[PDB]
Design a protein around this nucleic acid. Structure first.
Lengths: 96, 90, 941, 90, 78, 90, 96, 91, 81
RNA sequence: AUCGGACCCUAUCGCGAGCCGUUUUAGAGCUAGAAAUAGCAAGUUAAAAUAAGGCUAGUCCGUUAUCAACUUGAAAAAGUGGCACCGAGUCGGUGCU
DNA sequence: TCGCGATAGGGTCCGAT
DNA sequence: GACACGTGCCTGGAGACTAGGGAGTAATCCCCTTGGCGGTTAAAACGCGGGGGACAGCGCGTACGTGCGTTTAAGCGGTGCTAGAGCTGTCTACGACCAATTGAGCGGCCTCGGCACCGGATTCTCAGGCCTGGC
DNA sequence: CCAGGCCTGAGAATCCGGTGCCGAGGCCGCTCAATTGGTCGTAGACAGCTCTAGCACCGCTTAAACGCACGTACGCGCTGTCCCCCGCGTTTTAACCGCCAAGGGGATTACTCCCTAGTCTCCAGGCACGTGTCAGA
């Protein structure tokens, strides 16, 4: 499969169909959906790593969105990245 | 107890405004713009979550005002000042 | 290129490296381990800190106590072996019960009653004989046949506490008789043993006065009676009988009661301090042994009529109690002791009787005395006695050097004055005479002296023999016979010029000067002085060697050594010269490629006063280390100025060129100021394993707690009491241990305290020790010994000194800007007041800086808030006094264990560090002793 | 459309000894759609601005660097670069 | 009306914001601020709704309106 | 590309007693570009949220109602109704 | 008439804006009254701003329209201010 | 105050830049070369940046003035600018 | 070139602040404003040059600055965009 | 700065000696109170230990001193982590390497 | 806490490398 | 010297044809929403006291405003080239489109197990209290 | 002194033992969405060429910059004053929540049809440039 051709876990086929149907551009290079898949993969990997370490620091193996909120806000780069974003049931950063 | 309550709610992710009154408020404000429109409970809690988000976004700058004012706690002048600074107000 | 300055203190030894330009080199050193930073530069000035070198006196005292306990136990075993002959007739179980007595009945093999094994006889004994002295009196006065157990108890008691041998011989006291007027207070004709009668009189006084006091308190103030006598914590009568109440504080507590109640007899007896006494007293140690000997012999004569073996062994017991090891003999070891010199003619075990035959008293005494010092010029030759007649000739002519047969040979002393005497020879009336002097000084037992002088006793008279026995010399001279002689002949007559003795020592013309030409740790131990200064000197020598190591065998230019309140400093100097100057030229002469410098602290203090460099001890240890730099700079600044100075009115005014109102006014002064400015100074606390007593020498009552370490193997700590140990180096236990109810083997890598009691067992077998503690997966190579006083470091530079397995000390030392110190000195001492006015804001800055350093490092909230509150409230108070209070405050973060301190009057308790979790994460830093080399590795593996 | 299985697989790739709640799943899914929309829009705009009719990989790389402030975003780019080479491998 | 968000609820929100003390006038002025925010938000929501010509309100629609307002929140089927 | 001549025509019809500077022409053109892009992007995003590709004028009117404040939006709606009515007649 | 804008009484070119939207690729199919409505909104907005600029020019004693006049006008009107708050008009001058 | 208000009037009446061009041309050139060299500049673009940056400063300064007004302090402080930016969400 | 943001003359920033209408203008504020402007310049220049390298061209076009200012969120007038 | 002596004044070290003190157990506590409750009665002494104990088994020794870490090693002892320059809030920076 | 012995070591003198 | 008008030519905008598929439209089913109801219940609300929270005036220290006197490269401009924007024109790598295949991937399903809740220790710990061999 | 143990009071934080419920987590069955082979003409890659406008370059003038003296008036610290919400006790309320009825409307589906994309072709509205003239610094 195309993602298996890339050997990367993100849905290359679905990303290609999304960029086609979304009509962001008339034409799309074959490598472009793969590249988008990869960058999304890295970003979600960063987020999941932060969430998992926050969870193990919270003594709960299962991640509730509160983990996503704390992880993303506490990290400066993500905090600037998702500045406009509000994570549902996130609460506030433990800032005093 | 204010610090303890602050810790409790800051750690707690649960919403703070109870659902049904807020739902009725949403219904009434919808009346203002059109009659006979329905709200899915998912949509009502969506509005509520966004609302609490915006409110806490206000309250952070509300707290921020006091230190520069050399102020303790908050006055409505601080909130309107913060709104002006953000420029969303008017 | 570089010189080294040393200021050695009792606990801190500062070293500094300077260049020819009075500049301190800063060197990059590679940092080993698995840490981030791999090399860091530091200045080459620092200080070695170490716990003071504990004197050996405590060890000697406990040694003597150990020996005395062993010998007393030997005495009691000797009497036991004597009595067993008919004790078998009076049943053997008796002695075994005696031993078992300490054990509880739950564990006892036999009955609880020692003497009889039954309630009725034991109670009857106690009723008829409340104390052993009552049975003692019954035995000494009566002549009836008595039970063997009673006599055994009496003799054992008079032996185990026999008294002293302060007065030689034996006396028969009868209140020469002036010794025993105070204590006995009882007629000695009734019995030949006034001791027991006096003791029973004290008993009776106690008894009647207790009855009277109890009745009186029941009458006047019964509530006070019950409150006092029920509880022992009040340290009243109940506390004085059962609790640990000193009779003195008992009297102190009783006096208000006696005065409040109205009684006169108890009051006056209390003033006499004899009203109510424990039968054993602190003072009764004055009691002589001879009275015990007399009463023992009296009781023997009373009772030996019935028991044949008592009569047969009478002399045995007499000597057993009366015999005492002669002091000159020392230890009784069979050659197996580092401290023993005794020589035994017979190899059999020494006993209270064979010592006369087995031990060669004279030989042992001679070995003991010879073990003094021998001749300084030639160590092999022994020193002559201080009163040697040839030595007398020597000193007489040494004093006559500038200038006898009529005056010195007949008169005790000769005045013009002079300081020599031939009085000993005048009392006497050459080789045999020197032998006589040596025998008189060497030996001190009269009979031993008799045996020694029997060899030539054929000469003169036996009355002269008694005279020789009567007089004994003491002390030693300096030199031997052969070393003196020859020299004495030339001193007697030297022609025109009468050469001095030391001149003949330094006179190459004769062959006597030709005769004259004939390990670091071991030698430094062989030196004379306190062990503390010996530790300091060994440490400073090691530091100098490591400094040379840092220079890669590059010898320094100048080495300056300072010590506060001298021969010990010159010992340091000559040791450093001997070990550092190892190269000799073709003239067989030592070369001082590094100059040697001794300095006086007064001059450095004057320098600091002139240049505003006032040292304050209250400031963190850094300050002392800075003195090393000074001790170098000024010393160097001296030696380059005047070569006559380095060879060593004007010497009283040496500092004239120091002031402008070899050296530079600007450059040197600015370098000094910047050196004071730089914060990092290599303060190094030494690290080692604790060596001391096992625990607190005090024993506690029983309790259900694992804390207690049993005083004996079979005696349960929770039942038989017995602890509170000190801890030696800890052990880094990385293993898996049980956790939770399911006891999961989870990984723990933590501190396990190891006491000195556990050191032997652990070093014999670490694996068995650890697994006995419950550890599994013993990783031998990951077993890490952690000696006390190691250093750890937190993120902010915060430090944690490894004191206990569970406790930590402070390792940080805030550097203080020199202007702060100068202003503080001025506040402590016309221009001073104006400067204080100008720098009150500077004082505010100083206190703010100490507050922020505390907040950063110590993390102590409550005490800081309190001190700050007090600061605000008392800020109006005079600046001088507030400066003094900040001087007190400087210890808040100082190195070592936190201490309490008063701001003005508010006391600030020490904040102790009772957890070691943080050290498990902080870098673990092994350090070279001088501290320049570092190896830091995190505990995580 | 959901990416739940994909994010779960990646979570195992990064934190095997962890779980995730359905709420966190949905929030992360919204996140994926969000960042994807934003980055795709930047790519489309840049294509139009430089008259580029087709969306290749270089312009989306430029969009990545522009939008993402990540210090390792270039590393992410490198991942994409690796992916590119990996898809070049394909 | 608006007072379905009673003063203790406003206080809870403020404490979550970290407010030390809450003046009485704070409650009503915050009511006004959230009122105008709700006004504009639901206004855009109903606008999208009418274009959908389906009377019920859908959570995706309020997400869209929040996006357009420039203040975005995750997770509600977005 | 420029809206210039139409800007001139409208200016004369609204303000004949007035000229316009080149830089003013520039700013006018840039403003028209900004509003056109805003309205077009909103319209397309709404069309996709419809799932319907075709751009009917009602998408434009709802987007405009979203962008401009109320009364100005109503004026614009009236203008659009007039224009579409005239074109339907034409 | 040829120009459909003139047919509907509009100033802005319906064909130009239709081509602009088609280049924008907002959808492969765009209605025909949609460009008309868009041109209407453009004309009305430009007309309001032009009228305000001309009135401010009468206030400012200048017959022609200077670039800064538009900035003055927008700053004067709050309704447009909310629209263009972030907008930075070149040579616009500080808010008067 | 008397000349202060006249200075205010001069600044609000005009549209001239308040920064001489060269200290800005050279600065923008240097900052651009920081990321990559071999880069050439449109001068009109430099003017565009000049105006945009000056207006950005204008908005920041008026936010600062608002903060100072609430602080009963006619003298602004840099803490006021940083507070505005934080509230603005500028980082 | 060094400290051209400091080379931005203090009287120039004085004019900026008075145009802001502040009553009192201080050197501390001067340097703080210098720093903030440096930060903003760094951001906008980074984005603009990113566009420029994207454009496959060596020179910087003003339209690129228009794009970048849109990306920051402050759109610009007078050139198009 | 040293030398011997003399006089005084101290410290250290070694040895022989006591006496407390402590902690258990033995000094039948009694009545009433079954039990907490109270009164009363006595209350002084004794054994064994006084660093766990070790072996060298002595009427000995076991708290002095020494003591980052590795290797060489038993021990001893050696080596094992640069050189220059500019600065200094616990050390920052450059070059050969 | 008692004894006994020995070594240093400070401080002042009478003589000298 | 910049703008409005005049000026001449072309390609984008328009008018018309065609065909098609997006969308509107109506028809049907069921689902979520509304409502209302009932039976609790913790949160809301009213009030009270006090304590810190508010607030202003003055005085001082000091820093910024203002004036004056001095310095300096920005603006102008005068001067010339060439770097790369930019336009065109040819080649072609590829993405879309088409059709063909393929099961993989999603929603719907139930069961269980994976934390969650809690009432009761439980650990350890800490910050100060104690106490610690001698005549 | 001091500084370790410990203990001690207490008490700060942990930990969890037992219980319990609802979302993980996996199967059931199904098909639309992903993947793949083969073609076409097309976006753009790229070279040539150019020719502008950005770079280079600097110095005369001077107004703004730079610096410094003074004072004046502004920040705020302190103090003195004045009182208004916070915490809590108590009572009231609709919050909570579980249930169903129910049908309007949303979803889904097939019918129909026009309006829009693409195509042809028509032709002038507007592209840019010059000129004359008048508002402007």
């Amino acid at each position: 499969t195309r993602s298996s051709r890339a050997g990367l876990q993100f849905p290359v086929g679905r990303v290609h169909r999304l960029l086609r149907k979304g009509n962001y551009s008339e034409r799309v290079g074959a490598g472009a959906p793969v590249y988008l898949a990869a960058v999304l993969e890295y970003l979600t990997a960063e987020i999941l790593e932060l969430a998992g370490n926050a969870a193990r620091d919270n003594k709960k193996t299962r991640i509730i969105p509160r983990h996503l909120q704390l992880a993303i806000r506490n990290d400066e780069e993500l905090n600037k990245l998702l500045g406009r974003v509000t994570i549902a049931q996130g609460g506030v950063l433990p800032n005093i | 107890v204010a610090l303890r309550e602050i810790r409790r709610y800051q750690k707690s992710t649960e919403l703070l405004i109870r659902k049904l009154p807020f739902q009725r408020l949403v219904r009434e404000i919808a009346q203002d713009f059109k009659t006979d429109l329905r709200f899915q409970s998912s949509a009502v809690m969506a509005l509520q979550e966004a609302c609490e988000a915006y409110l806490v976004g206000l309250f952070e700058d509300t707290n921020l005002c006091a230190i520069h004012a050399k102020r303790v706690t908050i006055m409505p002048k601080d909130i309107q000042l913060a709104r002006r600074i953000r420029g969303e107000r008017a | 290129k570089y010189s080294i300055g040393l200021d050695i203190g009792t606990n801190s030894v500062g070293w500094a490296v300077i260049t020819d330009e009075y500049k301190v080199p800063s060197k990059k050193f590679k940092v080993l381990g698995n840490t981030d930073r791999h090399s860091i530069k530091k200045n080459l000035i620092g200080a070695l800190l170490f716990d003071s070198g504990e004197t050996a006196e405590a060890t000697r005292l406990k040694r003597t106590a150990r020996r005395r306990y062993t010998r007393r136990k030997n005495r009691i075993c000797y009497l036991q072996e004597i009595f067993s002959n008919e004790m078998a007739k009076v049943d053997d179980s008796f002695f075994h019960r005696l031993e078992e007595s300490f054990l509880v009945e739950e564990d006892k093999k036999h009955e609880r009653h020692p003497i009889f094994g039954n309630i009725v006889d034991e109670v009857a004994y106690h009723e008829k004989y409340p104390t052993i002295y009552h049975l003692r009196k019954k035995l000494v006065d009566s002549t009836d046949k008595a039970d063997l157990r009673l006599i055994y108890l009496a003799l054992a008691h008079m032996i185990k506490f026999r008294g002293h041998f302060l007065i030689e011989g034996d006396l028969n006291p009868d209140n020469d008789a002036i010794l025993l007027s105070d204590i006995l207070r009882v007629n000695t004709e009734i019995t030949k043993a006034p001791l027991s009668a006096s003791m029973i009189k004290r008993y009776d006084e106690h008894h009647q006065d207790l009855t009277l006091l109890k009745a009186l308190v029941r009458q006047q103030l019964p509530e006070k009676y019950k409150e006092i006598f029920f509880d022992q914590s009040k340290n009243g009568y109940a506390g004085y009988i059962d609790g640990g109440a000193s009779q003195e504080e008992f009297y102190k507590f009783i006096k208000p009661i006696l005065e409040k109640m109205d009684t006169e007899e108890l009051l006056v007896k209390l003033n006499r301090e004899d009203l109510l006494r424990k039968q054993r007293t602190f003072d009764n140690g004055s009691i002589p042994h001879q009275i015990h000997l007399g009463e023992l012999h009296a009781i023997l004569r009373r009772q030996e009529d019935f028991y044949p073996f008592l009569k047969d062994n009478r002399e045995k017991i007499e000597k057993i109690l009366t015999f005492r090891i002669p002091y000159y003999v020392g230890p009784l070891a069979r050659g197996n002791s580092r401290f023993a010199w005794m020589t035994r003619k017979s190899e059999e075990t020494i006993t209270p009787w064979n010592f006369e035959e087995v031990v060669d008293k004279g030989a042992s005494a001679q070995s003991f005395i010879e073990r003094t010092n021998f001749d300084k010029n030639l160590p092999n030759e022994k020193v002559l006695p201080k009163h040697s007649l040839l030595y007398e000739y020597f000193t007489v002519y040494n004093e006559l050097t500038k200038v006898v047969d009529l005056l010195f040979k007949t008169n005790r002393k000769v005045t013009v004055r002079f300081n020599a005497s031939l009085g000993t020879y005048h009392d006497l009336l050459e080789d045999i005479l020197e032998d006589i002097v040596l025998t008189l000084t060497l030996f001190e037992d009269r009979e031993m002296i008799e045996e020694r002088l029997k060899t030539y006793a054929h000469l003169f008279d036996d009355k002269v023999m008694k005279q020789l026995k009567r007089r004994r010399y003491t002390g030693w001279g300096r030199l031997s016979r052969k070393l003196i002689n020859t020299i004495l002949d030339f001193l007697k007559s030297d022609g025109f010029a009468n050469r001095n003795f030391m001149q003949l020592i330094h006179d190459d013309s004769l062959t006597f000067k030709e005769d004259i030409q004939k390990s670091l740790h071991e030698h430094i131990a062989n030196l004379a002085g306190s062990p503390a200064i010996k530790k300091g000197i060994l440490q400073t020598v090691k530091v100098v060697d490591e400094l040379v190591k840092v220079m890669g065998r590059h010898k320094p230019e100048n080495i300056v050594i300072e010590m506060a309140r001298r021969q010990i400093t010159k010992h340091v100097a000559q040791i450093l010269d001997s070990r550092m100057n190892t190269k000799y030229d073709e003239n067989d002469k030592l070369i001082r490629e590094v100059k040697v410098i001794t300095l006086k602290s007064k001059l450095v203090s004057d320098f600091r006063k002139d240049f505003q460099f006032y040292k304050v001890r209250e400031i963190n240890n850094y300050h002392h280390a800075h003195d090393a730099y000074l001790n170098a700079v000024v010393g160097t600044a001296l030696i380059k100025k005047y070569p006559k100075l380095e060879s060593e009115f004007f010497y009283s005014n040496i500092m004239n060129f120091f002031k402008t109102e070899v050296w530079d006014k600007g450059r040197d002064f600015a370098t000094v100021r910047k050196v004071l400015s730089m914060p990092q100074v290599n303060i190094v606390k030494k690290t080692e394993v604790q060596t001391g007593g096992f625990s607190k020498e005090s024993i506690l009552p029983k309790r259900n707690s694992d804390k207690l370490i049993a005083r004996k193997k079979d005696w349960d700590p929770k039942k038989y009491g017995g602890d509170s140990p000190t801890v030696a180096y800890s052990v880094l236990v990385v293993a898996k241990v049980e956790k939770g109810k399911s006891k999961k083997l989870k990984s723990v890598k933590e501190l396990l305290g190891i006491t000195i009691m556990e050191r032997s067992s652990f070093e014999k077998n670490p694996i068995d020790f650890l697994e006995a503690k419950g550890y599994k997966e013993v990783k031998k190579d990951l077993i890490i010994k952690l000696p006390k006083y190691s250093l750890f470091e937190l993120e902010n530079g915060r430090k944690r000194m490894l004191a206990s397995a569970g406790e930590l000390q402070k390792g940080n030392e805030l550097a203080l800007p020199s202007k702060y110190v100068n202003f503080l000195y001025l506040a402590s001492h016309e221009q001073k007041q104006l400067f204080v006015e100008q720098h009150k804001h500077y004082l505010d800055e100083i206190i703010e800086q100490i507050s922020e350093f505390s907040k950063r490092v110590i993390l102590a909230d409550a005490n800081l808030d309190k001190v700050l509150s007090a600061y605000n409230k008392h800020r109006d108070k005079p600046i001088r006094e507030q400066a003094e209070n900040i001087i007190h405050l400087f210890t808040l973060t100082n190195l070592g264990a936190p201490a309490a301190f008063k701001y003005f009057d508010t006391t600030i308790d020490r904040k102790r560090y009772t957890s070691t979790k943080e050290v498990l994460d902080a870098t673990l830093i092994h350090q070279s002793i001088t501290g320049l080399y570092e190896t830091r590795i995190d505990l995580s593996q | 459309e959901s990416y739940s299985i994909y994010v779960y697989k990646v979570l195992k790739q990064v934190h095997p000894d962890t779980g995730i709640s359905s709420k966190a799943m949905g929030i992360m899914n919204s996140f994926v759609n969000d960042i994807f929309e934003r980055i795709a829009g930047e790519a489309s705009r840049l294509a139009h601005y430089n008259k580029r009719s087709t969306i290749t990989s270089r312009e989306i790389q430029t969009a990545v660097r522009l939008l993402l402030p990540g210090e390792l975003a270039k590393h992410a780019v490198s991942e994409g670069t690796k992916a590119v080479t990996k898809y070049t491998s394909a | 009306n608006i007072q379905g968000i009673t003063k203790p609820a406003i206080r809870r929100l403020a404490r979550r914001g970290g407010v030390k003390r809450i003046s009485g006038l704070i409650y009503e002025e915050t009511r006004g601020v959230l009122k105008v925010f709700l006004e504009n938000v639901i206004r855009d929501a109903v606008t999208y709704t009418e274009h959908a010509k389906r009377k019920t309100v859908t959570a995706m629609d309020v997400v869209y309106a929040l996006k357009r307002q420039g203040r975005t929140l995750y997770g509600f089927g977005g």
